[PDB]
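Escalated from tier 1: 4-oxo-4H-pyran-2,6-dicarboxylic acid holo job.
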Amino acid sequence: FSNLFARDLLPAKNGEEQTVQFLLEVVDILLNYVRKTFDRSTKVLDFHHPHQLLEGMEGFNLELSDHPESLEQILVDCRDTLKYGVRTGHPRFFNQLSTGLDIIGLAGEWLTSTANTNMFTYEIAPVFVLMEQITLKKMREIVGWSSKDGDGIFSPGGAISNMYSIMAARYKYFPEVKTKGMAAVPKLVLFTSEQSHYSIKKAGAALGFGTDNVILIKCNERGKIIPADFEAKILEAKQKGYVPFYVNATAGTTVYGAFDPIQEIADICEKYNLWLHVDAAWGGGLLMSRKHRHKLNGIERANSVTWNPHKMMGVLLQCSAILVKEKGILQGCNQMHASYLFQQDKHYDVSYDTGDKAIQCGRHVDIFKFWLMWKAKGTVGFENQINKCLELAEYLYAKIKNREEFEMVFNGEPEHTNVCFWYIPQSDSPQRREKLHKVAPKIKALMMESGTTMVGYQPQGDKANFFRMVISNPAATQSDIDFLIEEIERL
Amino acid sequence: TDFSNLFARDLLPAKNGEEQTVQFLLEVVDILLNYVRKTFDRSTKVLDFHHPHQLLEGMEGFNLELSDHPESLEQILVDCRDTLKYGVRTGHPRFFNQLSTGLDIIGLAGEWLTSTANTNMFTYEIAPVFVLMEQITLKKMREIVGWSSKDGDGIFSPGGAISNMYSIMAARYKYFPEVKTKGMAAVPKLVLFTSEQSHYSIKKAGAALGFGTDNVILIKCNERGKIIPADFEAKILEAKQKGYVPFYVNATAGTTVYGAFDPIQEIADICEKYNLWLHVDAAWGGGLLMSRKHRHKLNGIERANSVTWNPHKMMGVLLQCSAILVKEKGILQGCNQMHASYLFQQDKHYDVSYDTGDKAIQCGRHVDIFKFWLMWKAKGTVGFENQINKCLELAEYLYAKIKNREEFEMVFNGEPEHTNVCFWYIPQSLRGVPDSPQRREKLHKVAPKIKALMMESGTTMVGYQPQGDKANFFRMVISNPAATQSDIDFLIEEIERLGQ
Ligand SMILES: O=C(O)c1cc(=O)cc(C(=O)O)o1
Ligand SMILES: O=C(O)c1cc(=O)cc(C(=O)O)o1
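Tier 2 regenerated the structure:
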C-alpha cells in the first residue's frame, strides 16, 4: 500500500479488492482504538500544545500538498490522528456533557456514512425520512404531548434547535416579520434563565431581536428560575410598551444541572400568552427514566422542546431535535414557497420533504445511529443506563458533601449528574475567592499533563472557578468516580 | 459468530464483552463492504423504489417501529442490511439526481475514523488535531480563492445554506454592529440583493435574520442565467431613493439549475462604488477553483468579502462539508461571541486563541474536517483537479451529444459553464410542433412521466424542474468520479427509451 494511491481504489476499474483491503486496514486501526477506549491503562489524552503539532510530531505532517500521499501514509495519518486526539469514550473522560462511545451508535454512524445521502427529500433518503418521523413521534409521546398535533426536525446541534424554537414562536405571533422584517412589528422580548445556555442570547442576536431584548430571569440558590421574577419581567416589558412572547425554561442547566419549574412557568405563559420552549438538551435523557422524568413535569404543556440524544442518551455527535407541539409552524415559518405546489408531478408524496420547514437546505443523516440504538437497547436500555449515571452522581455528591478538602458551590441536592464543587487548598473572604479561583485551573493543567482524567471547571456570577463533574458515560463506574475524587485531592 | 441471543447491553462497556464487540463491528463492516462493492456495479439498482406505506407497513421483516424492549444483535444486523437495501445508491455511476453524489473511499474511511473519535469542534482541549487541520485547510482555501496567506478567516458549517446565513450576519455586523444588542428595528430598512436564479438560502436567511423577504431584492438574469449588472446598479439606486440602506449582494458562482456564473468583476465594481459587502456563493462552483482550466469562471472572487464553498459538492466530500470564508479576520468572532464561561475559559493551560467555538452560530459542532483533509492528503490538489476536469469534460460530451439532436431541446442558448446540462426530451408528437402555450403545457408532463418510469426500473435518476415560464426540464449534473461516458450514453438512451 506504500506504492498504492487513492486514484487506484474504486471508482477506478478493477479496484474492488484493494478498496476492501484498504477499508479493513482502516477498520483494524479503529478496532484497536475502540478496544483501548475501554482500557483504563490508556491515557484519556496525550496532551500537546498547538505549536508542538504545527511544527510537527515525529512523522506527522498536517500540511497539504499538490501531490497525493500513498495509501500506507494515509493509514499512518489515521493512526496518528487517533494517537493525538482525546479518548471521549474513556471511562475517565468527564470533561463534557457528551461522553462515552456507544458501539451500536458507532455502527450506526459507519452505516450512515456508507449511505451518504441528504435528509431533505424522501426521494434520496426514503428510509431515513421515515425513521425520523417515527422517532420524532415517540419523542413527542414521551414528552407527554397528545397525538392530535405535533411536529419536529433534527438539527445540527441544540443551539440551532433553540434558534428554531424562537423562529417558530415569532412566526406564530408575528408572521409579518418573515416578509416585512423585525422593524414591521413592536419590540419583541424573550426570557431565559440567568443560568440558561448562551444559545438563547446568540439566536436573539442572529434573528434580529438584539441581545438587549433577551431578558435574564433571576435564579434561586439551586440555580432554578424564580417564577415571580419571570412574571415581574413580563409586566415590566408590557409597561414599557414592549411585546413579551417567548420563554426558554431550562430542563437541566449546563453547569448546576438545575431544572426550571416548568409548571409554574407554563401557568404564567398561559396567563400572559407566551410561547413556552423547554431546553431539555441536557435534561431530556431523564424523560426516558420513570424514576427521574418528574424533574421535567410541565413539559407536556410546552410549545416546543430542544432535546439532545447526543448528551445523556449517548448517541454519537450530533443528534438534536426540536419538537414543536403545533404542526405547520416550522413549515409556515421556513417555506420560501407555500403548499403542495411541488405536486402533482412528483412520483412520491412531497409532504415528506423537509427542505421547506428547515433553515438548512442540505441536511446530514443523524437519525439512523439514534434509531439503531433505540432498536438495540429499547426504552428500557436507555432507562437503566441514565439511572446508573444519576446513581453514580448521587454517590459522588454524598462522598464529598462534607469532605474537608471539598466545598459545595450551592446549597441543594443535584437534580442531574452535575456535581459542582471546589477543591480547597487549606481554608468566605474576597481575598480567599482570589486564592480559590486559581486552584481548579492548576489541577486541570496537571490533569491534562498526566492524562489520568478530564474534568471541566468554570466560574459563575461572583463564584470562583469551580469543578463541575458531570456523568453521561455508561463506561464510568463507582471506582472511576473514586479515582477522580482521589485524583483531585492528590493534585 | 452467533448473535441470536446477544444484546447491545452485553457489548463494551460491559466487562468481558470485548471479543463480541469486535465480532459484531466486523459483521456490520462486512455488510457495508458488500454494499460498497455493489455501489460501483452498474447492474445494481440506483434505488429500489417504495412508496412510504410499503416501508411503514413493514417490508418482510423490516420493522421501523420503536419499542420498550431490545432486539438481539442478529436482528440489528438484519435491520442494517435492510436499511441499505431500501436506500439510494448515491455513489452509483448512474445517479445524477443531485449536486452531491459519489462515494469517495478516502472520505468514507475519514468519516468512520471521525465517528470513532466522536468529538466536538468547539475547543482545542477536546479536538486538538481537528482544530489545527481545520486552520490549515481554511488557510489553503483562502489562498486558492486569491486572498492573502496571513489575513483571513472562516469556519466549517452544517451546510452551505448556513454558510450563506453567516455571510449576511457578518455583512450586517460589519456595517451595523448596533443590531447585535439593539435589534434590526434600531437601524434603517436594510436591503440585500441576489440573483433571480440564486439559491433560496438567501431569502430564508433574510426571513430568519429579521430583514424580511420583501427586503431580499431579486436581480434580473440574462438568457444565460447571469445577473445583468445594470439591473443591480438600478436596484441599489431604487432602495437608496426610498431611504433604504443597501449593504450586501450575493453573487452566485455556479447556480444549481443552469450552472451559470455571475459576473463577479462587474458586480464587485458596483459594490466598491456604493460601499456594499460582496459575498460569493461558490457552494456549487467552488470545486472549479481547483481546476487551472476552469477557475476563470470565478475571476473576481479575490475581491469578495466572503465565500461559501461546499467541498461536499464538486470535490466529492461526504455530506456535510461546507465552509464560509471571510476576508477580514475578527468579523466572525465579533458578530457571534457570547463569552460563555463554561466553554471558552480564558485562564486555560494552553493558548485559548485556538478555541474557535465562539465565532460560530453553533455550540456543539460535528467534525467535518477530517474526511476532507484526508481526501486532500490522498488526492493532492492534482487529484481534485483531475476529478473536477473529468466531470466537466463529461458535461461537455453530454451537451454536444444532445445539442443538435431532434429528440431533444436545449433550455437556454449557451455553453454550459458548470456540469449542469439543461434540456427537454421531445416526444415524436411534439416534433416539430411550433412553440405555443399549448405545446408548453403538453411538454411540462413529459419530464415527470419519464422520471416516474425511471423510478420503476431504478436504472438511473435525474432531476427535472421548471423555471419561470419554461415547462419542466431535465437538469443533468455530474459530480460523481464514478460516472463515465457510457453512463452518459445510457442516460440519453434511457430518457429516449422511456420517452417513447
Ligand atoms: O457537547 C458537549 O459535550 C457540551 C456542550 C455544552 O454546551 C457544554 C459542555 C460543557 O460545559 O462541558 O459540553
Ligand atoms: O447537496 C445536494 O445534493 C443538493 C443541494 C441543493 O441545494 C440542490 C440540489 C439539486 O437540485 O440537485 O442538490
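The two ends of chain B are 52 Å apart (CA to CA).
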